[PDB]
Design a protein around this ligand. Structure first.
Ligand SMILES: *[C@@H]1O[C@H](CO)[C@@H](O)[C@H](O)[C@H]1NC(C)=O
Ligand SMILES: *[C@@H]1O[C@H](CO)[C@@H](O)[C@H](O)[C@H]1NC(C)=O
Lengths: 44, 49
């Protein structure tokens, strides 16, 4: 009933966004193949 | 004048792929290089004269 219930496994993740600048690489088909950050690391 | 786009050029058949949400096609200089005809779905390649 409302008191007493068994549930199965479940996992989820919640994350927060922020204004960033990214570099995106397209392919011949037109699908995004890779993306790289611009404000994370000196190499980035 | 495809869907309100006053331009002059040559229209030919194009084999390029379109994502379902994608409609237009663009190049490095922000020049429209592909359109989808509103009445009938098709791939057209705009090439200047
Ligand atoms: C489950 O069934 C019983 C049978 O009478 C009922 O009393 C109970 O309200 C039911 N569970 C819920 C959550 O309503
Ligand atoms: C408009 O054109 C499309 C494409 O041929 C057709 O499927 C549709 O029935 C037409 N509708 C009207 C109201 O003419």
């Amino acid at each position: 009933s409302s008191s007493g219930w068994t549930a199965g496994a479940a996992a989820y993740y919640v994350g927060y966004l922020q204004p960033r600048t990214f570099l995106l690489k397209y392919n011949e088909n037109g699908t995004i193949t890779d993306a790289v950050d611009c404000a994370l690391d000196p190499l980035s | 004048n495809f869907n309100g786009l006053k331009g002059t050029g040559v229209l030919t058949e194009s084999n390029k792929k379109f994502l379902p949400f994608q409609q237009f096609g663009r190049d490095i200089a922000d020049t429209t290089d592909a359109v989808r005809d509103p009445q009938t779905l098709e791939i057209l390649d705009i090439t200047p004269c």
